[PDB]
Amino acid sequence: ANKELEEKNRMLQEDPVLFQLYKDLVVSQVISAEEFWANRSDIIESIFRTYPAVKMKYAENVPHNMTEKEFWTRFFQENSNAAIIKRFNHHSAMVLAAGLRKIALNLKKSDRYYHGPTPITSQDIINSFQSIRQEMEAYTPKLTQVLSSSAASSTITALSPGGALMQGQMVPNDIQSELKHLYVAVGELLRHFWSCFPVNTPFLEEKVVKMKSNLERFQVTKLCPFQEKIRRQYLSTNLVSHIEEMLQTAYNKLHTWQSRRLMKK
Amino acid sequence: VRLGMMRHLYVVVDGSRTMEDQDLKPNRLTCTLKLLEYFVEEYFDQNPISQIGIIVTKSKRAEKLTELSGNPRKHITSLKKAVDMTCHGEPSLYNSLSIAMQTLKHMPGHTSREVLIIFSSLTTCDPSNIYDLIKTLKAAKIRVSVIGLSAEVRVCTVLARETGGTYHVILDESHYKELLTHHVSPPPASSSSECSLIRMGFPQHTIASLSDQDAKPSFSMAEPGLTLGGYFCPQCRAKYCELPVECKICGLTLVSAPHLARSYHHLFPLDAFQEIPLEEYNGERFCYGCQGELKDQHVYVCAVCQNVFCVDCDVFVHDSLHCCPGCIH
Amino acid sequence: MKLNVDGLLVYFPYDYIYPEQFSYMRELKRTLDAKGHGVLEMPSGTGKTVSLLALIMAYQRAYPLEVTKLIYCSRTVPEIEKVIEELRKLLNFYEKQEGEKLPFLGLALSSRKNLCIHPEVTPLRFGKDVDGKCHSLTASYVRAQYQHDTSLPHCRFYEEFDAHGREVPLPAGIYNLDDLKALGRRQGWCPYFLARYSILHANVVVYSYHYLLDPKIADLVSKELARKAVVVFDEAHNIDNVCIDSMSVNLTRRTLDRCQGNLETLQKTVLRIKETDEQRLRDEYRRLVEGANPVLPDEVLQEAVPGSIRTAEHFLGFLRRLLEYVKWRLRVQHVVQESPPAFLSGLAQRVCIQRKPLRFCAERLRSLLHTLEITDLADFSPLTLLANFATLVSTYAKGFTIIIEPFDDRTPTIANPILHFSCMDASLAIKPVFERFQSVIITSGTLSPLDIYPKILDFHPVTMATFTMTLARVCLCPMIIGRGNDQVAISSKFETREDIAVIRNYGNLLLEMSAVVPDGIVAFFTSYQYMESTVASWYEQGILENIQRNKLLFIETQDGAETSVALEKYQEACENGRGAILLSVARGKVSEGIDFVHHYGRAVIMFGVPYVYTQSRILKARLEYLRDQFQIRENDFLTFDAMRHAAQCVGRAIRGKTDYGLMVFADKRFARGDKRGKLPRWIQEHLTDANLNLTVDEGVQVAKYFLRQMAQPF
Ligand code: SF4
Ligand SMILES: [Zn+2]
Ligand SMILES: [Zn+2]
Ligand SMILES: [Zn+2]
């Protein structure tokens, strides 16, 4: 059946983001669309489920020279006393049937955590210890020793923006939307490209997807510079170099791992 | 006991009408939402590598309020929005569990799957039988630990014990914080549960090289403006505003060094300190930890350092600091 | 876990015993030491049998000569099956301690219908039909014909059992009904008769009351062999009703019409016999001259001579005459008639039937019936019922009464009158038990005060001990809700039953309670007619729909098949989260038969005091006699029956294992001191005055609080 066609129509306009990027892969005629998707009331309903007799009646009494309002009228319509008990037990039984479809841890080296991932004679201790011991026998020099006009002033100058220890542009905005669209464009297609890359997949069926994806990387990126060229040749300002890293670094991973494959063979 | 360092827990909340009833001081639904915010905020604060996903089940339908994520701010925002939720309908445990199972079915083996169901209305109308689902959960090694509200319902009683989780009921609002607070800690991994190594990458924060020379402009990765500097990836090479976020491309978890060091206190729990009220030859009137006079007949000591800690120090050390001050020496 | 009781050392399998158990064993030992019949109450349904059994095992070993055998009876076979499991567990524990087999045998008897291995009777389910087939297979003619080994189905199991079962008795072992059936199959012996033979030497024998009360069957299996045996009844609070029903015999127009047709078949059978077999069968006349069982107990039973009735032609006319008198006396249209001694005089004068020849009619019928080589007794069963009634009336009427109802209740005019012979005192039928057996212990739960039973049953108890369960956690949380949100009297009085507010209040209570009560809850009404009116009133209102939304609701009907299906669905609802509200009648067979356990009937609801239609003449005759003799007020017994019955159905929620369960009484009457006094000790003492008159909404709130405390673990 044409299940895919119906799904596309539902998402044709309901959600822009999903369809917006899918077309872009075909706007420039990059690759076939087959690989795109291949890789990636209540009251009447209750009576419909609850009472089998109504279900049978509805099929046999399907609207024919009648009205739904008239059908609604038919719903509500000592021996009579027993009917309520039988109906409720039957009704309760039907509802019930309706909802029933047929290690102590241990370690060898805990010191490693104490000196964790963060990376990096004897007489000197004695000599230093004694010298400091006799240092503070004179104390409370606060009057002048703590600060001086020259020393204090130098600190203020350093704290100024020009001074040391105090080091200290949204011009493009319309272009921002295109980059975000491009960013989603790269992310949407990189995801599939990186979907199988981390896993080695030593199998032809899984590896074939890698080759198709690996070749597809060039195809999607073949058209990328063309869009880049137009944007770049505007004011030569606010260069977009990050977007290149993902593609170039994707190439390097592709080329390196592809080269590694030959060595393994 | 070895614990599950990385866990994917779902906080299923019932949108039942019974939540409308106010047995507690505020509206029951608001209170759970108010307190659930504490758990969500605290949950990541004591387990960064983990991730959470909330589900709300109302009118016999289970709708994923938020997918699995590592940002407590996003989840908390949904909680604020859910405060004004209609809260009219009947929950369906089968719908809720089924929704969680689908998402959690594809999770990696190393992670410790979990679910926390805040049960309020004792009734549970479901499209199909749940015992078949219960069997699937055990084969799916999903730990479901319901937290009932005002009911020791049998259906959940088997669920928690049969599936390996824990069942509880809210004695009062104050007791409610204790129950959820217990689930914050990584539950121990049982015999059935297994473990495996997980790949991760540490994103070195980078800024402009030298006065905007060879700059790296970009906006974000999930109205973000251009950013001079941001976290990158060993493989994505994508600018991530904040950490820890799973690679939107690689699928590999990115996490800074401190976050991993945050959870080490779980591995090495501090041994409790014996409480002796009398002085017992303790000649230090001032507490060693806080250098404050002991106005109570209470003292705490270690088995190695053998120091003195008042009630305030011991309460603090075992609550937040998760280490003995003096015994570090 | 050996217990060094004051009397002796008693072995006990389980880890710990509550303080009440200590009192239980010593109290029981006191009566056993005194060798005198007594009555006692213990709340726990489970663990009571083992504690009761445990002392007997120790007592038997300490004083084997004092007590011959233990006769522990249970109300229903489904409940006796679980009892023997407790004994089996105890025996293994006791045997393990000793380390070797001991001369101890335990088995449970039952009807051939419940247990058998013969394929022909297997498809049949009706009890009467089973006896007819088995009787025919084991009939002397078949046995005599079996010797000839002619071409005719002979039930092999009994044939080889006589040659084998008689010679070799089973040394020891515990065999439940299911296990006993398997043993017979492998050994090719009757599970029924083999157990019957074992009664000669069986330390513990357990069977229902109807095997120990009705003289027709109880006497033969309960022969004097048990000169000094510890006979015990379990949950025997309604012992009188079962004891009285054994004596009571009902004769109806439909039954009488069946008898007339059956008698005609009997007449035809004799005619065939006369032309075919006369001399050989006539020999039984000499046996009769020389000199299904009679219902007369030991002393009452008489076998002097057959009397005037000595031949089939003569005897059949005797029944013909008696049948006609009952036929005419029954067809009379008038008010309900009572004539205990006058009916015998009226029958004797009207159709010239002396009582003495009429006394032996039932026995003569069986003797004559045997001579007829009938195919089965099932067809003629109604005739025997009349014969049993025929001899019973002619025997004695001092503590009896013939009640004739030309018009039946619930019917403006019915052409099927029923002649009642309801008894009035249970002491008559239970008298042989007390005399034959040295001591009887009437152990029961939910027992209304003990002092009445010696008045109802003519006996002198050694002790009157009431036990209240003592637990670290207060499992049961009883309450009485006599006032609703409207603060209006909620008593389900006969004149006040028509009140809409009272009907509304019960729906409000159930609706509100259903919100808080977890899965599993049961509601008990006073009568089916009242239940339907309450259901209809709720159905017309939105209260029932709200209850349906809160939880599933099930109602109970007279037919067992509907009840069985509904009850099975109920158990399904509790297992899932749906929960079910099973509305039932307190006096309905469903309530007594069913047992409610953890997450089953969590909040048992007693809607109104359970009372019978006082217009029932049969109850009046029983009620009137108790006022005439034994000095019991008419209202006192009537309240006692309701209080004992109300406690009967509501006491199941606390079966055992300290499974939390609350009981709510939806009637201000229970709050009255008289009602509370008749309430069982364990339920009564826990109940306090503070919560005695809880409001409908106030009761709901405390119930929610109660669940919270019980919800948390120990
Ligand atoms: S003789 Fe024994 S086996 Fe045969 S029908 Fe009777 S009880 Fe069953
Ligand atoms: Zn990455
Ligand atoms: Zn301190
Ligand atoms: Zn220390």
- Compute the radius of gyration of chain C from its Cα atoms: 28
C337: which 2 tokens? 């008639």
| Cα C94 to Cα C416: distance, rounded to the nearest angstrom | 58
* Pocket of ligand 1 contains residue C158 by CB under 6 Å: yes
Rounded Cα distance between C497 and C172, Å, is 58
- Residue C139: CB atoms within 10 A of its CB come to 19
Atom of ligand 1 nearest to the CA of C158: 1
HSE on the CB side for C210, CA within 13 Å?
Answer: 10
What is the token pair recorded at B201? 């990458």
For chain C, the residues before each gap (C–N > 2.5 Å) are 291
- With tokens 């003096």, the residue in question is B326
Dist CA B221 CA B243 (whole Å): 11
Nearest CA distance, A89 vs chain C (angstrom): 6
Give B106 to chain C, closest Cα distance, Å. Answer: 28
Indicate the helix (H) or strand (E) that contains C332.
none
Does ligand 1 come within 6 angstroms of the Cβ of C194?
no
B contacts of C519 (beta carbons < 8 Å) = 122, 153-155
Instruction: Give percent helix, percent strand, percent coil of chain C, each to the nearest 5.
Output: 50, 10, 40
Whether A243 and chain B come into contact, CB under 8 Å, resolves to yes
Q: After which residues is chain A broken (C to N over 2.5 A)?
A: 40, 77, 102, 120, 168
Q: Do the beta carbons of residue C441 and residue C656 sit within 8 Å? A: no
CB distance C486 to C671 below 8 Å: no
Q: Which of A116, A242, A249 sits opposite B216 (nearest CB)?
A: A242
Closest CB to B219 among A113, A183, A195: A183
Residue C23's closest CA among C2, C49, C52?
C52
> Cα(B265) to centroid of ligand 3, in Å?
21
Range B6-42 burial, b when 16+ CB lie within 10 A, else e? bbbbbbbbbbbbbbebebbeebbbbbbbebbbebbee
Other CB atoms closer than 10 Å to residue C379's CB: what's the count?
17
| Residue C222 assigned as binding residue | no
Cα torsion for B88, B93, B99, B100, to the nearest 10°? 120
Closest residue in chain B to residue C660, using alpha carbons only: B152
**B288 C-alpha to center of ligand 3: Å?**
6
Resolution (Å units): 3.9
**C155 CB less than 6 Å from ligand 1?**
yes
User: What's CA C294's distance to the chain center, in Å?
Assistant: 21
Q: How many CB atoms lie within 10 A of CB C484?
A: 22
Contacts with B267 from chain A: Cβ below 8 Å: 105, 113
Q: Is the dihedral of CA B251, B257, B258, B263 positive or negative?
A: positive
B61 closest CA partner among B94, B17, B102, B103:
B94
Query: Which residue's CA lies nearest to atom 6 of ligand 1?
Result: C134
B179 C-alpha to ligand 3 centroid (Å): 28
- Chain A residues inside the 8 Å CB shell of B213: none
DSSP state of C94: H
First to last CA, chain A: 43
- Compare all CA atoms of chain C with the CA of A79 and give the residue at the minimum distance: C532
Cβ burial, residue C194 (10 Å; 0-12/13-18/19+): buried
C164 within 8 A of C193, measured Cβ to Cβ: no
Residues 589 through 608 of chain C touching chain B, CB cutoff 8 Å: 598-599
The number of the ligand 1 atom at minimal distance from the alpha carbon of C157 is 3
Q: Which two tokens stand for residue C323?
A: 């049948």
CA dihedral angle for residue C683, residue C686, residue C688, residue C691, rounded to 10 degrees: -80
Dihedral (CA of B258, B261, B266, B268) sign: negative
C180 lines ligand 1 (CB under 6 A): no
Task: Retrieve residue C441's tokens.
Answer: 């212990």
Q: How many alpha carbons fall within 13 Å on the CB side of residue B165?
A: 29
- Which atom of ligand 1 is closest in space to residue C138's alpha carbon? 1
Strand C70-73 relative to strand C230-233: parallel, antiparallel, unpaired?
parallel
- Is residue B223 within 8 A of residue B172, CB to CB? The reply is no
Answer whether C463's CB lies under 8 Å from C38's CB: yes
Residue of chain C with shortest Cα separation from A81: C532
- Strand arrangement of the beta sheet that strand C521-525 belongs to: C479-480, C662-666, C603-607, C521-525, C580-585, C552-554
Cβ–ligand 1 distance for C116 under 6 Å, the answer yes
Q: Does ligand 1 have an atom closer than 6 angstroms to the CB of C137?
A: yes
C190 labelled ligand-binding? yes
**Nearest CB to B93: which of C577, C704, C707?**
C577
CA dihedral C692, C693, C698, C700 (to 10 degrees): 60
Do the beta carbons of residue C516 and residue C707 sit within 8 Å?
A: yes
Chain B touched by A41 (CB under 8 Å): no
Helix, strand, or coil (residue C621): helix
Q: Which two tokens stand for residue C295?
A: 């219902």
Indicate the pairing of strand B51-58 with strand B61-64: antiparallel
Residue C3: C-alpha distances to residues B171, B279, B306, C266 (Å): 39, 46, 48, 63
Residues across chain B: 329
Ligand 1 mutation target, pool C193, C197, C376, most atoms within 8 A of CB = C193
Place of tokens 């019915």: C414
For residues B79 and B61, give the distance between their C-alpha atoms in angstroms, rounded to a whole number: 18
Contact C708 B150 (CB under 8 A): yes
Q: How far apart are CA C701 and CA C512, in angstroms?
A: 10
Using alpha carbons, list the distances in angstroms from residue B165 to B15, B143, B162. Answer: 22, 5, 8
Q: Are A166 and A159 in contact (CB under 8 A)?
A: yes
Atom of ligand 1 nearest to the CA of C120: 5
Nearest to A84 among C536, C562, C569 (CB): C536
How is residue A55 written in tokens? 């279900």
- The CA distance from A61 to the nearest CA of chain C, in Å, is 28
Three-state helix/strand/coil letters over chain B: CCECCCEEEEEEEECCHHHHCCCCCCCHHHHHHHHHHHHHHHHHHCCCCCEEEEEEEECCEEEECCCCECCHHHHHHHHHHHCCCCCCCCCCHHHHHHHHHHHHHCCCCCCEEEEEEEECCCCCCCCCCCHHHHHHHHHCCCEECCEECCCCCHHHHHHHHHHCCCCEECCCHHHHHHHHHHHHCCCECCCCCCCCCCCEECCCEECCCCCCCCCCCCCCCCCCCCCCCEECCCCCCCCECCCCCECCCCCCEECCHHHHHHCHHHHCCCCCCEECCCCCCCCCCECCCCCCECCCCCCEECCCCCCCECHHHHHHHHHHHCCCCHHHC
Determine, for residues B126 and C577 on separate chains, whether the beta-carbon distance falls below 8 Å.
yes
Q: From the list C533, C552, C557, which residue is nearest A96 (CB)?
A: C552
Say which residues have a Cβ less than 8 Å from residue C358's Cβ, sequence separation at least 6: C318, C322, C347, C390, C391, C394
H runs (alpha helix) in A42-173: 42-50, 52-60, 68-76, 79-98, 111-114, 122-133, 149-159
CATH number, position C501: 3.40.50.300
Helices C77-98, C177-187: inter-axial angle, 10-degree rounding: 80
Instruction: Please give the Cα distance from C606 to B264 (Å, whole number).
Output: 58
| Experimental approach | cryo-EM
Query: Is there a contact between C579 and B18 if contact means CB atoms under 8 Å apart?
Result: no
Say yes or no for a CB contact (<8 Å) between A99 and B248: no
Judge: A198–B239 Cβ closer than 8 Å, yes or no. Answer: no
Q: How far is the CA of C324 from the centre of ligand 2 (A)?
A: 104
Residues near C320 by beta carbon (within 8 Å), at least 6 away in sequence = C263
- Choose among B126, B153, B168: nearest Cβ to C518: B153
Ligand index nearest the alpha carbon of residue C111: 1
Instruction: Give me the domain span that covers residue C573.
Output: 476-711
Q: How far is A90 from chain C (nearest CA, A)?
A: 9
**Ligand 1 pocket member C117 (CB < 6 A):** yes
Could you tell me which chain A residue has the CA closest to the CA of B236? Answer: A246
Is position C614 annotated in a ligand binding site? no
- Quote the CA–CA distance of C577 and B18 in Å, as a whole number: 15
